[PDB]
Swiss-Prot record, chain A:
Additional remark text: Mutagenesis experiments demonstrate that the minimum viable CTD contains eight consensus Y-S-P-T-S-P-[A-S-N-G] heptapeptide repeats. Identical and simultaneous substitutions in a number of consecutive repeats are lethal: 'Ser-2' -> 'Ala-2' (14 repeats), 'Ser-5' -> 'Ala-5' (15 repeats), '2-Ser-Pro-Thr-Ser-5'-> '2-Ala-Pro-Thr-Ala-5' (10 repeats), 'Ser-2'-> 'Glu-2' (15 repeats), 'Ser-5' -> 'Glu-5' (12 repeats), '2-Ser-Pro-3' -> '2-Pro-Ser-3' (15 repeats) and 'Tyr-1' -> 'Phe-1' (12 repeats).
First and last residues shown, out of full length: 2 to 560 of 1733
Binding site for Zn(2+) 2: 106, 109, 147, 166
Cell compartments where the protein resides: Nucleus
Protein name: DNA-directed RNA polymerase II subunit RPB1
Annotated stretches, region: Lid loop: 242-254
Transmembrane annotation, as ranges: none
Lineage: Eukaryota, Fungi, Dikarya, Ascomycota, Saccharomycotina
PTMs per UniProt: The tandem 7 residues repeats in the C-terminal domain (CTD) can be highly phosphorylated. The phosphorylation activates Pol II. Phosphorylation occurs mainly at residues 'Ser-2' and 'Ser-5' of the heptapeptide repeat. The phosphorylated form of Pol II appears to carry, on average, one phosphate per repeat. The phosphorylation state is believed to result from the balanced action of site-specific CTD kinases and phosphatases, and a 'CTD code' that specifies the position of Pol II within the transcription cycle has been proposed.
Swiss-Prot record, chain C:
Name of the protein this chain belongs to: DNA-directed RNA polymerase II subunit RPB2
Residue window of the full protein shown: 1128 to 1224 of 1224
Misc: The binding of ribonucleoside triphosphate to the RNA polymerase II transcribing complex probably involves a two-step mechanism. The initial binding seems to occur at the entry (E) site and involves a magnesium ion coordinated by three conserved aspartate residues of the two largest RNA Pol II subunits.
Zn-finger segments (C4-type): 36-58
Protein family (similarity comment): Belongs to the RNA polymerase beta chain family.
Swiss-Prot record, chain D:
Further details from the record: Present with 6090 molecules/cell in log phase SD medium.
Subunit: Component of the RNA polymerase I (Pol I), RNA polymerase II (Pol II) and RNA polymerase III (Pol III) complexes. Component of the RNA polymerase I (Pol I) complex consisting of 14 subunits: RPA135, RPA190, RPC40, RPA14, RPB5, RPO26, RPA43, RPB8, RPA12, RPB10, RPC19, RPC10, RPA49 and RPA34. The complex is composed of a horseshoe-shaped core containing ten subunits (RPA135, RPA190, RPB5, RPO26, RPB8, RPB10, RPC10, RPA12, RPC19 and RPC40) where RPA135 and RPA190 form the DNA-binding cleft.
Gene Ontology molecular functions: DNA binding; DNA-directed RNA polymerase activity
Subcellular localization: Cytoplasm; Nucleus
UniProt KW Oxidoreductase keyword: no
Source organism (scientific name): Saccharomyces cerevisiae (strain ATCC 204508 / S288c) (Baker's yeast)
Family the entry assigns: Belongs to the archaeal Rpo6/eukaryotic RPB6 RNA polymerase subunit family.
Protein keywords: Cytoplasm, DNA-directed RNA polymerase, Nucleus, Phosphoprotein, Ribosome biogenesis, Transcription
GO biological process: nucleolar large rRNA transcription by RNA polymerase I; ribosome biogenesis; RNA-templated transcription; termination of RNA polymerase I transcription; termination of RNA polymerase III transcription; transcription by RNA polymerase I; transcription by RNA polymerase II; transcription by RNA polymerase III
Region annotation (Leucine-zipper) ranges: 43-64
GO CC annotation, single: nucleus
UniProt keyword Nucleus, yes or no: yes
UniProt-recorded name of the protein: DNA-directed RNA polymerases I, II, and III subunit RPABC2
UniProtKB/Swiss-Prot annotation, chain E:
Region annotation Disordered: where it falls in the sequence: 1-20
A Pfam match: RNA_pol_Rpb4
Biological process terms in GO annotation: DNA-templated transcription initiation; mRNA processing; nuclear-transcribed mRNA catabolic process, deadenylation-dependent decay; positive regulation of translational initiation; RNA-templated transcription; transcription by RNA polymerase II; transcription elongation by RNA polymerase II; transcription initiation at RNA polymerase II promoter
GO MF assignments: nucleotide binding; translation initiation factor binding
Cited function: DNA-dependent RNA polymerase catalyzes the transcription of DNA into RNA using the four ribonucleoside triphosphates as substrates. Component of RNA polymerase II which synthesizes mRNA precursors and many functional non-coding RNAs. Pol II is the central component of the basal RNA polymerase II transcription machinery. It is composed of mobile elements that move relative to each other. RPB4 is part of a subcomplex with RPB7 that binds to a pocket formed by RPB1, RPB2 and RPB6 at the base of the clamp element.
UniProt record similarity statement: Belongs to the eukaryotic RPB4 RNA polymerase subunit family.
Subcellular location(s) per record: Nucleus; Cytoplasm; Cytoplasm, P-body
Gene3D superfamilies: 1.20.1250.40
Cited SUPFAM superfamilies: HRDC-like (SSF47819)
Protein name, per record: DNA-directed RNA polymerase II subunit RPB4
Provenance organism: Saccharomyces cerevisiae (strain ATCC 204508 / S288c) (Baker's yeast)
Length: 554, 107, 97, 87, 177, 270, 171, 112
DNA sequence: AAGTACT
DNA sequence: AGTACTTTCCGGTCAT
RNA sequence: UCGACCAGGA
């Protein structure tokens, strides 16, 4: 898969380490400064500016170049880019924690709010479960709002022991939109409401202790709290936000490629304020704009209404939305995919096939193909199918040689020619007795998918045997069914040895067989039984002839 | 073991875990009127020596965590008074094979 | 056609291991990417010709692997990265068990 | 790693071949056979790999070894030869 | 590539790649404490020329042999005698081995597996580290200075007199030509 | 849901039921390690029936003109009557079938004696029958030792778990117990000879078969049982097309959710 | 300096070669992809020792193609120069920027200005040399060099060495 | 005893319809719901919170929400989950894949 | 629509 | 007790 | 040529 050999050893993923990007890494990784927000037109001149998409990153226009990485389009995954923000911004999804963390540590000095000194704390420090310490620790110090400097040790409540210092009262905190605000209570009276600048929070975290990280559900190497705050923004490469060209002289940009466009703009505008007429706090009116965009770009279905509608009132597909369950990546792209070597039509019963068979219409059997490997055992038969062509039935439609190149049997000036080579593959037509996976959704049974024997037949329908009807749970009132075709000598095996209908006969779901006899056959099998019912020679003979395994003994 | 009637003062109970090794337990009368272990449903449990336990583990190649658990406050866990770490052996009747041996560690 | 969630669940129940893979990889996505044996990412600048491999940053050129995973998964990952989250792809377990 | 390797003695798994095992052995063997691998049985004229495999597997002339991992990671090794084939 | 008997758990930040100097600080792949296949520990393996010439020849030879069990089914004088052992058990395109045999066979200092044996039995009473216990064997040295200077890892590990005696018994064992 | 919540559960090579963590969920799949497919409703004769009838069927007394096997059944019939060393095995057997009785009546209190159990014995014999054209006329040729001592030698081989130790070999006995009750129920001296005139040939066959057949009904380490069990419940949940309790579908939903406020709460006190 | 390190390699064998003398083939290929190789972490792989007791272990069969993969554990003779390592070899090429000595499978180069002063460079010589008061360095002349710095690259290793210290020069 | 009920009830839901399910199944489920500690629900609220990997739970009801707090708490995934592999395109340790297969060079010679 | 869990 | 928040296989039209 | 809706099929 992918094609083109790589002297790189190949393995399987064994572990997945989850973490958070460190601004420093993000930068190292990147191969693009990403300064301009525009797309291309070097003054209308078509290409791509060293600005956004391809300031060295992936490509388009069917042209090798991927930082000489060549290979072009198919093979060159994307190469992340970055974009140095102006000022720290939250991470739309982490806000929750970033807050819950501050309530766990006090500013100025930045350190825990409950040492081994407080006993209720001890118990919360033995619990080995990042998700649980941090869910208990928090519940314990969200209340205390005074960075204690002296506490009563394991002895007398009379004697006071010392530790870290700076009693600077701790402000309770609440969430207003994408910003954190808290009040500081003054005694003698009345509050003191001020906005917690990212620049500030970020800092308090940077200073939190090494063993403090960890004590709270974190990891010194992969996810330091200080990273929940975005300083450097990774820039997904085309393939993540590909275009769509209507030939040429038009556009086709993707949703994401815009929010960056926005994020970029909104970023620059800011910068050009702190180095110019800076009416101090007429800026934090444009710094919320960055915090917004760089927020909506990831998540766009929040509580603070503003959907960040894109001209035309269309919502905007945020990254999060792409993964959100069903119809999306995870659930609709990975856990279940569209696949090749498959067909579907209308099913109709046929009292003439064996249980384990399935009638496949020539139409399809000439479409669906099975890759067979040229071997001395079959060379002959195989070369024949090839010759035969891709239009006659028992034939084939593709021969592939070692030199990883497809010979399209229906065009190639050598169709009729060609001598096979042991080792070559000859994608041929599905033939009588090619195990296949037959099925009728909704699939809620082992049995909703069984392996049948392919029996190429005329007319347009999958003709399944009656008795294997109740397992798929099907009628012919216009019901359709799916057929999947194996691909590897061993794949078949997996069907034929575990999925074959004969096997499914007795079901564990209820320790009793799961297919029987119905309609005519049943209704009739009763009548044909009755004491009252007798049959005479002439017929008893045909009947006998019908059971294929008749020992020939009238 | 101390059997209170209607209740104990929240000022008192915070004096039990203050004299180790020794341990104390609090039981309400109304809860002991009937022995729960006598109930049709509740199968009989059993304590395991920290010998019999270190065994169960070695014989299944199990780590403490992968073991089925019982609540530190679970009714029967109290009846026998388990301790965070003690394993109980639950032996019950079965409609598939007369008797079934199960184990419950504690949390 | 579509080999949906349910169609998976069945094969899993069947124990039709390889077949499942075959439906999910070879007969659909299936893509080949390169990794950094150090920082489990797609960083690797594979020139698959002059065999150069690099990966400035974790700075390599030596410890590199190659893997086969559904293109959709690659994307899943890249997408996660753009959200500043890191999905490390390691080719050897070190946590035992 | 050999502490995770269990001796041919002390062995404890099923003495019989699991349906999945054989299912896969046959497949795997078939695959290899179709690959032009060497065949260890006289083909009584057979020419279908999974058919030849079914044959190899009945004279137990299949050079394969099923390694059976356990929940903790230690494994046991058995040979198509050994393994009884009921079914 | 070709992994090396020690899975060093690299946790992301690969940055500390020290220098390589005759400070006896050789790459992590050459600590004095490396691991053998059986799983045991074992001192690094330092080869002084001519001691290597013998290990190679020794294998390149015993190869030509087990290369025939299966077949059925004086300075300038050794240059020719070796070229053959190669054009028989070598890849022929291992232009390195060739050149490694010339060099190894020209600058060698011993011809008898008995002489090389004494050399070793001698230097191996020094407690010195393998790399030194090599250079000393493959480098002419008349003075404690020519020595303690071309192998600066020595300097304080051995009295000049002592090292000088060793150098004496070396030129005395140094096979002629 | 049901599915996604049990994907990862399969029987591992040790014959334990676990998930992706390795957390044992069942120590022996289905509390018996048998694959649902190889099972049928059999009847534990030893349970029902009057204390009276029980005797008339399973009781053998070699020290009694009216409670001994009539020599018309056993070849060595007359030379047995009175033998004391046999009447001890003959009594061991009976004290067992009895222990069995009480045991079952402690498990299946309903009295219901028909249960799904691996190895269909009724049939396995029915074949032993017409396979050897056994005549209900002439006498058997089994030693009473033959019978009682082979039946015992049988249970030894119905292995589910294998382990080379106590804790394990102990579970073995457990996960077999019930099946054996049924075994001892159908291979009781009196029965084996009076009801199904088995010859030594027949019997030795009946045994061999029961063993092999059993050994097949064991579960295969590999089975992704979870996905199975899930569907097995969830499937007939779709077919549910619909005394004043909460009902089906809506109730099932109620249970899987573990809802505090169930529409019907009831509670039956005897 | 030359070493004998314990290495291992993974070879992916096609079902094709699943013959009778497979072991044979494996070994054979082991050799094709090792003897003559080069790394920064192993340097020059020169020769596989104990050709006979080469451990193959059971190889496992991959799972899409029958190709099996064995972790061939072996042992061999290696050699990777180091900075500060003193070694003597034979000169090969000599220019106006220096001569290049050849310490074994490797080539150490010495810069004109990394030598002494009294040693100039004679151009109109045949073959090309470097003259002194009493010394003369050219082609075959044997030198003893002190490798100042190493530079790994592709399938080889180069380095620059000096002869400006004592007990360094010709012999 | 709870289990015993939880089962008994579940059994009744399937019996009230006149259908039949072999113990083992309803049992297994009733068990999965109980072991952990008490009554773990078959819903995003319960089971999909267990120590199971991320990618696995990731595929059901909370996805991103779950993935986010995965990299934030630097989780590590075993890739022992059926799902896990399905997402990676690898053969899951399931039936056919609950073991490895090897060519025993030795036995590969006695065969000829 | 509902239900829970979360605050 | 109230407030807040996520989940619920396979034509034609219009327009981004 | 990503999509939103509507009608409909088992
Ligand atoms: Mg219908
Ligand atoms: Zn590229
Ligand atoms: Zn403070
Ligand atoms: Zn890297």
């Amino acid at each position: 898969v992918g094609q083109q050999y790589s002297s790189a050893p190949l393995r399987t993923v064994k572990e997945v380490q989850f973490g958070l990007f460190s601004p420093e890494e993000v930068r190292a990784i990147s191969v693009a400064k990403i300064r301009f927000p525009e797309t291309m037109d070097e003054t209308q001149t078509r290409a791509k500016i060293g600005g956004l998409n391809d300031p060295r990153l992936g490509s388009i226009d069917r042209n090798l170049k991927c930082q000489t990485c060549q290979e072009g389009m198919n093979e060159c995954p994307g190469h992340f880019g970055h974009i140095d923000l102006a000022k720290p911004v939250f991470h739309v999804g982490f806000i929750a924690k970033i807050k819950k963390v501050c309530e766990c540590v006090c500013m100025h000095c930045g350190k825990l709010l409950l040492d081994e000194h407080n006993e209720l704390m001890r118990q919360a420090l033995a619990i080995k479960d990042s998700k649980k310490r941090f869910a208990a620790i928090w519940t314990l110090c969200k209340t205390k709002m005074v960075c204690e400097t002296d506490v009563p040790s394991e002895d007398d409540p009379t004697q006071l022991v010392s530790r870290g210092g700076c009693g600077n009262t701790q402000p309770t905190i609440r969430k207003d939109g994408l910003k954190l605000v808290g009040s500081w209570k003054k005694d003698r009276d009345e509050p003191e409401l001020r906005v917690l600048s990212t620049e500030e929070i970020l800092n308090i975290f940077k200073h939190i202790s090494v063993k403090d990280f960890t004590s709270l559900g974190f990891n010194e190497v992969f996810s330091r709290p200080e990273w929940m705050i975005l300083t450097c923004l990774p820039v997904p490469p085309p393939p993540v936000r590909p275009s769509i060209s209507f030939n040429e002289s038009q556009r086709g940009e993707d949703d994401l490629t815009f929010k960056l466009a926005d994020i970029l703009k909104a970023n620059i505008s800011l910068e050009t304020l702190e180095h110019n007429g800076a009416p101090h706090h007429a800026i934090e009116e444009a710094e919320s704009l960055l915090q917004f965009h760089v927020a909506t770009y990831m998540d766009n279905d929040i509580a603070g209404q503003p959907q960040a509608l894109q001209k035309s009132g269309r919502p905007v597909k945020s990254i999060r939305a792409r993964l959100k369950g069903k119809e999306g990546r995870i659930r609709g792209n990975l856990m279940g995919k569209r696949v090749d070597f498959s067909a579907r039509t209308v099913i109709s019963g046929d009292p003439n096939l064996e249980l384990d068979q399935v009638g496949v219409p020539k139409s399809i059997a000439k479409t669906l193909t099975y890759p067979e490997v040229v071997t001395p055992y079959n060379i002959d038969r195989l070369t024949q199918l090839v010759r035969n062509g891709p239009n006659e039935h028992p034939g084939a439609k593709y021969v592939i040689r070692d030199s990883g190149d497809r010979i399209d049997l229906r065009y190639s000036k050598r169709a009729g020619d060609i001598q096979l080579q042991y080792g070559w593959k000859v994608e041929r037509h599905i033939m009588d007795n090619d195990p296949v996976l037959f099925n009728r959704q909704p699939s809620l049974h082992k049995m909703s998918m069984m392996a049948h024997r392919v029996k190429v037949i005329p007319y347009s329908t999958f003709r399944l045997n009656l008795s294997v009807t109740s397992p798929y749970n099907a009628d012919f009132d216009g019901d359709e069914m799916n057929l999947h075709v194996p691909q590897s000598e061993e794949t078949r095996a997996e069907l034929s040895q575990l999925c074959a209908v004969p096997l499914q006969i007795v079901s564990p779901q209820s320790n009793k067989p799961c297919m029987g006899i119905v309609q005519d056959t049943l209704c009739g099998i009763r009548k044909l039984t009755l004491r009252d019912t007798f049959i005479e020679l002439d017929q008893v003979l045909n009947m006998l002839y019908w059971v294929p395994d008749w020992d020939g003994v009238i | 073991i101390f059997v209170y009637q209607n209740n104990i003062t929240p000022s008192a109970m915070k004096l039990v875990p203050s004299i180790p090794p020794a341990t104390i337990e609090t039981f309400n009368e109304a809860a002991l009127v009937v022995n729960i272990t006598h109930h049709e449903l509740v199968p009989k449990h059993i304590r395991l020596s920290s010998d019999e336990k270190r065994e169960l583990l070695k014989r299944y190649r199990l780590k403490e965590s992968q073991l089925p658990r019982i609540q530190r406050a679970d009714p029967v866990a109290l009846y026998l008074g388990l301790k965070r770490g003690e394993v109980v052996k639950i032996i019950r009747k079965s409609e598939t094979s007369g008797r079934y041996a199960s184990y419950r560690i504690c949390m | 056609l579509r080999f949906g969630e349910m169609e998976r669940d069945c094969m899993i129940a069947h124990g039709a291991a390889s077949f499942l893979k075959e439906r999910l990889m070879e007969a659909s996505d299936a893509f080949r990417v390169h990794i950094c044996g150090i920082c489990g990412l797609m960083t690797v600048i594979a020139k698959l010709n002059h065999n150069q491999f690099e990966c400035k940053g974790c700075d390599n050129k030596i410890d590199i692997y190659q893997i086969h995973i559904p293109y959709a998964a690659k994307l899943l990952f890249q997408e996660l990265m753009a959200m500043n989250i890191t999905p490390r792809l390691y080719t050897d377990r070190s946590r035992d068990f | 790693l050999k502490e995770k390797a269990i001796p041919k003695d002390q062995r404890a798994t099923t003495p019989y071949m699991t349906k999945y095992e054989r299912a896969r052995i046959l497949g795997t063997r078939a695959l290899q056979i179709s690959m032009n691998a060497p065949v260890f049985v006289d083909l009584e004229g057979e020419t279908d790999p999974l058919r030849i495999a079914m044959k190899e597997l009945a004279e137990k002339k299949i050079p394969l070894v099923i390694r059976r991992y356990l929940p903790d990671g230690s494994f046991e090794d058995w040979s198509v030869e050994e393994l009884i084939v009921d079914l | 590539s070709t992994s090396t008997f020690q899975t060093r758990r690299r946790r992301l930040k690969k940055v500390e790649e020290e220098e390589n100097a005759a400070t006896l600080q050789l790459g992590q792949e050459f600590q004095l404490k490396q691991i053998n296949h059986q799983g045991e520990e074992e001192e690094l393996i330092a080869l002084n020329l001519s001691e290597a010439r013998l290990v190679i020849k020794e294998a390149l030879v015993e190869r030509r042999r087990a290369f025939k069990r299966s077949q059925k089914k004086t300075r300038e004088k050794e240059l020719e005698s070796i070229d053959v052992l190669l054009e028989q058990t070598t890849g022929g395109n291992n232009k390195d081995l060739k050149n490694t045999m010339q060099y190894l066979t020209n600058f060698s200092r011993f011809r008898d597996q008995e002489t090389v044996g004494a050399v070793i039995q001698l230097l191996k009473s020094t407690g010195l580290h393998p790399f030194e216990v090599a250079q000393l064997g493959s480098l002419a040295c008349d003075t404690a200075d020519e020595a303690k200077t071309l192998i600066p890892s020595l300097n304080n590990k051995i009295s000049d007199d002592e090292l000088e005696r060793i150098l004496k018994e070396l030129s005395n064992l140094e096979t002629l030509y | 849901r049901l599915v996604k919540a049990l994907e990862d559960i399969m029987v591992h090579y040790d014959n334990t039921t676990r998930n992706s963590l390795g957390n044992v969920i069942q120590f022996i799949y289905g509390e018996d390690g048998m694959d649902a497919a190889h099972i049928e409703k059999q009847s534990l004769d030893t349970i029902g029936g009057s204390d009276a009838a029980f005797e008339k069927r399973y009781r053998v007394d070699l020290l009694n003109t009216d409670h001994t096997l009539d020599p018309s059944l056993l070849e060595s019939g007359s030379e047995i009557l009175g033998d004391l060393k046999l009447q001890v095995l003959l009594d061991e057997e009976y004290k067992q079938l009895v222990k069995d009785r009480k045991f079952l009546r402690e498990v299946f209190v309903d009295g219901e004696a028909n249960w799904p159990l691996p190895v269909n014995i009724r049939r396995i014999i029915q074949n032993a029958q017409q396979t050897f054209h056994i005549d209900h006329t002439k006498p058997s040729d089994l030693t009473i030792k033959d019978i009682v001592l082979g039946v015992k030698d049988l249970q030894e081989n119905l292995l589910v778990l294998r382990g080379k130790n106590e804790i394990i070999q102990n579970a073995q006995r457990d996960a077999v117990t019930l099946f054996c009750c049924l075994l001892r129920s159908r291979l009781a001296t009196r029965r084996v000879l009076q009801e199904y005139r088995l010859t030594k040939q027949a019997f030795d066959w009946v045994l061999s078969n029961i063993e092999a057949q059993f050994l097949r009904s064991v579960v295969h380490p590999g089975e992704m049982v979870g996905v199975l069990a899930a569907q097995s419940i969830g499937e007939p949940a779709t077919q549910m097309t619909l005394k004043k309790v909460t009902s089906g579908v809506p109730r099932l939903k109620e249970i899987l959710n573990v809802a505090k406020n169930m529409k019907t709460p009831s509670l039956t006190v005897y | 300096m030359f070493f004998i390190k314990d290495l291992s390699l993974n070879i992916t064998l096609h079902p094709s070669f699943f013959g009778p003398r497979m072991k044979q083939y494996l070994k054979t290929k082991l050799l094709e992809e090792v003897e003559g190789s080069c790394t920064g972490k192993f340097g020059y792989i020169l020769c596989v020792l104990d050709y006979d007791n080469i451990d193959i272990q059971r190889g496992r069969i991959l799972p899409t193609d029958g190709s099996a993969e064995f972790n061939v554990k072996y042992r061999a003779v290696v050699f990777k120069p180091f900075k500060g390592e003193v070694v003597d070899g034979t000169v090969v090429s000599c220019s106006q920027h220096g001569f290049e000595v050849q310490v074994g499978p490797m080539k150490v180069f010495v810069t004109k200005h990394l030598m002494p002063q009294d040693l100039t460079f004679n151009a109109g010589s045949n073959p090309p040399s470097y003259q002194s008061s009493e010394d003369v360095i050219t082609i075959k002349s044997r030198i003893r060099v002190k490798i100042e710095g190493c530079i790994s690259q592709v399938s080889s290793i180069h380095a620059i060495g000096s002869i400006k210290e004592d007990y360094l020069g010709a012999i | 005893a709870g289990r015993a009920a939880l089962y008994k009830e579940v059994y009744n839901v399937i019996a009230s319809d006149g259908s039949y399910v072999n113990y083992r199944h309803m049992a297994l489920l009733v068990d999965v719901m109980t072991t952990q500690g008490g009554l773990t629900s078959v819903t995003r609220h319960g089971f999909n919170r267990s120590n199971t990997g991320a990618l696995m739970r990731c595929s059901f009801e909370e996805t991103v929400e779950i993935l986010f707090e995965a990299g934030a708490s630097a989780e590590l995934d075993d890739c022992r989950g059926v799902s896990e592999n399905v997402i990676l395109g690898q053969m899951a340790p399931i039936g056919t894949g609950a073991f490895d297969v090897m060519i025993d060079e030795e036995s590969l010679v006695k065969y000829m």
